[PDB]
Structure 1
Amino acid sequence: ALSLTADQMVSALLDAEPPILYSEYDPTRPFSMMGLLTNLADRELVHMINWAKRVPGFVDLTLHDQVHLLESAWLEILMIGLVWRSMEHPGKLLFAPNLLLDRNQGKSVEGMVEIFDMLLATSSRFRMMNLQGEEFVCLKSIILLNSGVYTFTLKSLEEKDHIHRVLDKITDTLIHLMAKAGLTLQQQHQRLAQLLLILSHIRHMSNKGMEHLYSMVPSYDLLLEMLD
């Protein structure tokens, strides 16, 4: 992972990309939204485990650390995936190709429209920045590696050091993508910052979402079982 060039990193992440899934409702039957959003989230998680295993550097970590990172990040990762898919559908969230929802559809569950609104605003922000596919995959891997790295022994010190070196490789890669796109050195650092600052909002959204779910979620054991 640490010997990868920028191009190889990008290629590795594009190749790791999980599939776009479909919602499981009978489309011949009349139009629970929570049920739909929960089942879809559950199925995407399985694919997320597989994707994570293909992010360079991730399988170098201990099982326990892999679980911790996924436990911290999974909802952020679903949400960034959603916002990216939704980017060319103004005012709509593309949960699946057959489940494209507006804010009014979110109003049927108490507390949900607020979450839909934040996701829609993020998709809007991505649209305004003209986020590229290659930048998206970098950001999604940054979330996986970064979200739990501050909440973890000699092994632990080595693990954190490795995570930060891999994150540095992804930073390098982002800059290289922006240099290749023809941005000036100024523009490259400005855009890097703009992209990383959106991750704080994605964190925020995840916290607001987890709050909703706790008020009613993959356990450590399920993540461990799937990762192990």
Structure 2
Amino acid sequence: LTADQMVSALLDAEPPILYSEYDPTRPSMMGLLTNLADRELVHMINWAKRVPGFVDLTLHDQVHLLESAWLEILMIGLVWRSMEHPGKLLFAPNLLLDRNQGKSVEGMVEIFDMLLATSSRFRMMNLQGEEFVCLKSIILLNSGVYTFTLKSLEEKDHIHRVLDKITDTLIHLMAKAGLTLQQQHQRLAQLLLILSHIRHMSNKGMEHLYSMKSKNVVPSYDLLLEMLDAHRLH
């Protein structure tokens, strides 16, 4: 694929923005966030299978990547959605929350605060949609590569080749916009350093989920495999 075709593939693969399920005519938070994220995950699977190179991996490796990255992907999506809404997190168009509304759950305002900080950072850098889809694909391919035989060596080589292709695509987007070569590598670095903070927020979020001690709230490898291991009957 060319860089322009890579971008086009990623934009067309974008998942939709889902709504929270609550009667708007009625006067709770963990349940809304749980239901929303669970519905988003199904669309995640569909999106990941359209990330170029992802379906060339073994199904086992596909599951490992999604297992490691799913919460990071949910959060970067949230941060991107919330970019143009200072001080608020657009979990859904009908669920736009501020940090005060997170005080009703222990541990929530801390996570809200980091998401709000990342969204403000996105805003100051004026993150573009084309950069955002590249970053999200990078998360999917990178976050689990470190926890994977002759086959595994070939899978890791392919992942790094795709990641390199995404780097080239980000640089190409930046060159097309008229940035100097110095501005290009400076902006590439700034965007990739943000991914370390997204990892950070995900780990804090995973801590919260595991503390909930709920059977199904963290998606199992078997569930993720069931979702990814689709048949060809449709």
User: TM exceeds 0.5?
Assistant: yes
- How many residue pairs get aligned? The number is 224
- Matched residues in 2 for 1:222 and 1:103: separation? 32
Structure 1, residues 173-192: CA drift from partner, whole Å, max 9, x if none? 00000000100000000000
Secondary structure at the aligned position of 1:74 is classed as: helix
In the TM superposition, residue 102 of structure 1 has moved relative to its aligned partner by: 0.3
Q: What SS does structure 1 have at the residue aligned with 2:89?
A: strand
> Within 2, Cα distance between the matches of 1:105 and 1:146?
33
Secondary structure of 2:32's aligned partner: helix
In structure 2, the residue corresponding to 1:207 is in which secondary structure?
helix
Point out where structure 2 has 5 or more consecutive residues left out of the alignment: 213-217, 230-234
SS at match of 1:94: strand
Deviations, residues 49-103 of structure 1 (Å, cap 9, x unaligned): 0000000000000000000000000000000000000000000000000000000
CA distance in 2, matches of 1:192, 1:151: 25
Q: Distance in 2 between matches of 1:145 and 1:205?
A: 18
Return the alpha-carbon distance in structure 1 between the equivalents of residues 151 and 12 of structure 2: 30
Q: What are the residue-to-residue correspondences of 1:135-214 with 2, within 5 Å?
A: 135-214=131-210
Distance across 2 between alignment mates of 1:209 and 1:106: 14
Partner of 1:132: 128
Task: Find the residue that maps to 2:97 and give its secondary structure.
Answer: strand
Q: CA deviation at 1:122?
A: 0.1
Q: How many Å apart are 1:108 and its aligned residue?
A: 0.6
Query: 1:15 aligns to what?
Result: 12
List per-residue Cα deviations over 1:80-131 (Å, max 9, x = no partner). 0000000000000000000000001111100000000000000000000000
Where do 5+ consecutive residues of structure 1 fail to align? none
- SS of 1:108's equivalent in the other structure is coil
Distance, in Å, in 1 between the alignment partners of 2:48 and 2:131 is 17
Q: Shift of residue 41 of structure 1?
A: 0.5
Cα offset, 1:40, TM superposition? 0.3
1:195 Cα offset (Å): 0.1
Give the TM-score normalised by structure 1.
Answer: 0.98
Per the TM alignment, residue 203 of structure 1 is displaced from its structure 2 partner at its CA by 0.1
CA distance in 2, matches of 1:159, 1:40: 32
1:7 deviation in Å? 0.2
User: Using the alignment, how far apart are the partners of 2:161 and 2:48 within structure 1?
Assistant: 17
Structure 1 stretches of 4+ moved >4 Å: none
Deviation of residue 151 (structure 1)? 1.0
2:215 matched residue in structure 1: none
Q: Secondary structure at the match of 1:150?
A: helix
Match in the other structure for 1:223: 224
Mapped partners of 1:58, 1:78: distance in 2: 18
The equivalent position to 2:105 in structure 1, one of 100, 104, 109, is 109
Determine the structure 2 residue equivalent to 1:38: 34
* 1-structure distance, mates of 2:103, 2:33: 14
